[PDB]
Design an enzyme around this catalytic site. Structure first.
Site, PDB file in Angstrom:
ATOM      1  N   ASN A  65      39.017  40.302  31.744  1.00 38.81           N
ATOM      2  CA  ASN A  65      37.608  40.436  32.061  1.00 38.81           C
ATOM      3  C   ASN A  65      36.712  40.189  30.837  1.00 38.81           C
ATOM      4  O   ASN A  65      37.121  40.385  29.693  1.00 38.81           O
ATOM      5  CB  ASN A  65      37.239  41.755  32.773  1.00 38.81           C
ATOM      6  CG  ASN A  65      37.592  43.010  31.989  1.00 38.81           C
ATOM      7  OD1 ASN A  65      38.512  43.038  31.192  1.00 38.81           O
ATOM      8  ND2 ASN A  65      36.878  44.106  32.303  1.00 38.81           N
ATOM      9  N   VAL A  66      35.499  39.727  31.114  1.00 38.17           N
ATOM     10  CA  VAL A  66      34.514  39.369  30.089  1.00 38.17           C
ATOM     11  C   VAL A  66      33.152  39.848  30.576  1.00 38.17           C
ATOM     12  O   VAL A  66      32.522  39.221  31.391  1.00 38.17           O
ATOM     13  CB  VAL A  66      34.479  37.876  29.796  1.00 38.17           C
ATOM     14  CG1 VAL A  66      33.455  37.554  28.655  1.00 38.17           C
ATOM     15  CG2 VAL A  66      35.872  37.348  29.403  1.00 38.17           C
ATOM     16  N   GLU A  67      32.723  40.996  30.077  1.00 40.61           N
ATOM     17  CA  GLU A  67      31.462  41.611  30.439  1.00 40.61           C
ATOM     18  C   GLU A  67      30.295  40.967  29.717  1.00 40.61           C
ATOM     19  O   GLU A  67      30.482  40.215  28.770  1.00 40.61           O
ATOM     20  CB  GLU A  67      31.517  43.119  30.142  1.00 40.61           C
ATOM     21  CG  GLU A  67      32.532  43.838  31.040  1.00 40.61           C
ATOM     22  CD  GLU A  67      32.668  45.317  30.810  1.00 40.61           C
ATOM     23  OE1 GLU A  67      32.204  45.817  29.740  1.00 40.61           O
ATOM     24  OE2 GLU A  67      33.274  45.963  31.738  1.00 40.61           O
ATOM     25  N   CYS A 115      36.625  39.015  43.950  1.00 44.04           N
ATOM     26  CA  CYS A 115      37.867  38.381  43.538  1.00 44.04           C
ATOM     27  C   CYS A 115      38.769  38.068  44.717  1.00 44.04           C
ATOM     28  O   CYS A 115      39.418  37.014  44.730  1.00 44.04           O
ATOM     29  CB  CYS A 115      38.544  39.207  42.471  1.00 44.04           C
ATOM     30  SG  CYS A 115      37.626  39.144  40.885  1.00 44.04           S
ATOM     31  N   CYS A 120      35.325  38.760  36.168  1.00 49.52           N
ATOM     32  CA  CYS A 120      36.569  39.503  36.346  1.00 49.52           C
ATOM     33  C   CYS A 120      37.761  38.722  35.797  1.00 49.52           C
ATOM     34  O   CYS A 120      37.739  37.493  35.684  1.00 49.52           O
ATOM     35  CB  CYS A 120      36.802  39.844  37.823  1.00 49.52           C
ATOM     36  SG  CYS A 120      35.665  41.003  38.559  1.00 49.52           S
ATOM     37  N   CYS A 137      38.681  43.384  43.113  1.00 50.04           N
ATOM     38  CA  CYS A 137      37.424  43.648  43.797  1.00 50.04           C
ATOM     39  C   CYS A 137      37.203  42.647  44.894  1.00 50.04           C
ATOM     40  O   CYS A 137      37.874  41.618  44.980  1.00 50.04           O
ATOM     41  CB  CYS A 137      36.254  43.698  42.821  1.00 50.04           C
ATOM     42  SG  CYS A 137      35.562  42.093  42.298  1.00 50.04           S
ATOM     43  N   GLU A 162      40.457  38.156  37.309  1.00 51.73           N
ATOM     44  CA  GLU A 162      40.925  37.272  38.366  1.00 51.73           C
ATOM     45  C   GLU A 162      40.099  35.981  38.447  1.00 51.73           C
ATOM     46  O   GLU A 162      40.660  34.921  38.772  1.00 51.73           O
ATOM     47  CB  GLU A 162      40.958  37.977  39.713  1.00 51.73           C
ATOM     48  CG  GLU A 162      41.710  39.299  39.723  1.00 51.73           C
ATOM     49  CD  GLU A 162      40.813  40.472  39.474  1.00 51.73           C
ATOM     50  OE1 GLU A 162      40.266  40.586  38.360  1.00 51.73           O
ATOM     51  OE2 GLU A 162      40.584  41.233  40.413  1.00 51.73           O
TER      52      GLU A 162
END
Ligand code: ZN
Ligand code: ZN
Ligand code: ZN
Ligand code: ZN
Lengths: 123, 121, 122, 125
Positions: free
Chosen positions: D45-47, D92, D56, D89, D58
């Site tokens: 993940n990369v916020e 995804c 996400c 989620c 995925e």
């Protein structure tokens, strides 16, 4: 829940959809636990991934109009037929209605838990 | 444009922000070319990248309420100070207000084209 | 100063060919030089639910981190003809997170720092 | 799989989770997927400071699927900060469906299962 009323409202709002890229307008309407109805339509963008679903619009209106919990939601497509929320909308709807939120389906409404089992969540 | 009134409306709607993850509530209010004011607040999700910005909410309300074009927008943060829309919202707003859309800033509004030059389109 | 833009564009064009863009019909590739000397690439991946589409530049950021992290130094985004494209607003914000204001973005008239493309950024 | 090597996917998902960019949540996630050419693709993940621009793990998997030469996803494991299996989620689930279909197997602590079980009656073509 007056499902016929919700579908009527979803069809009405779908006429305002901004979907010039897909040509696929969507309306949605939901009953809130305070008894009011909120609505939304899809709004696409030239950058496809910035498009907003009708169900997203519904959740935004839920909160801007004073908050609450969603009890029931109908989404309708271009022909007036009931459409299934995309997976993103299922997750967003779960936050604001929970597993017991009723979702309209071409074949009869059913709880959101049936449409997003074992959901990712705060637990 | 009454900027003071847009800012107050933005603060008012921010009270309904659903931002329990960031604790950073945001409100936005915009004047539409039909004379309507539309509002919106951020709504975060447990899956962070499914969060919706206040400005997105404004654009949703624009169309669900009958359509039109945005003429002026004010976005406000937790201290009531004016905020610049994030890049996503700059792109989304461009579609519905154009480069001439006026964006509130502390010392006076500026056009969106300044905030998103040479915009993808 | 040492960025080989022709080479970076060529990587973007290469990756563009793998795009999943059946709904727009418009494939996009992006390539970025990282401060560890590697080039990461990405192509757009559209979805039936249009708003779940991922831009090429988003894919670049994913590769940046999956491959060990770093900072982006320079980025080129192109269509199939090799014509340089400007990142969309969402991607400008996402790229700022990983490259900062001084990240160089390829442009016909010479590359431009991201701060010029996304001023006074959130 | 029934013979998919879930332990290998889980290990790769844990590996990649170490590189997550999740400073806002502090909730790093990794994901690994088997492709039908036999290779494994990974993602973390990369916020973003604007929370709604977060990607996400995925999503990162699906990006790598295509940039790495395409193919169809056969099996996918997502793991959370403790190394335990995590459910994708809903966003995804929808994205994954496009690239693996209803029969894509998703790792689950009770036994992996087809994506259709997790996103029934999916919005689609
Ligand atoms: Zn949706
Ligand atoms: Zn925003
Ligand atoms: Zn983009
Ligand atoms: Zn996800």
């Amino acid at each position: 829940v007056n499902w016929n009323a919700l579908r009527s409202k979803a069809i009405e709002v779908s006429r305002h959809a901004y979907a010039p890229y897909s040509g696929f307008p969507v309306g949605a309407a939901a009953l809130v636990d305070d008894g009011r109805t909120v609505t939304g339509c899809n709004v696409e963008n030239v950058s496809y991934g910035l498009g907003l679903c009708a169900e997203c619009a519904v959740v935004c209106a839920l909160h801007s109009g004073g908050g609450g919990r969603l009890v029931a939601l109908s989404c309708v497509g271009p022909d007036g037929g009931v459409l299934m929320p995309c997976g993103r909308c299922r997750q967003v709807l779960l936050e604001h209605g929970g597993p017991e939120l009723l979702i309209d389906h071409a074949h009869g409404p059913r709880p959101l838990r049936e449409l997003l089992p074992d959901a990712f969540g705060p637990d």
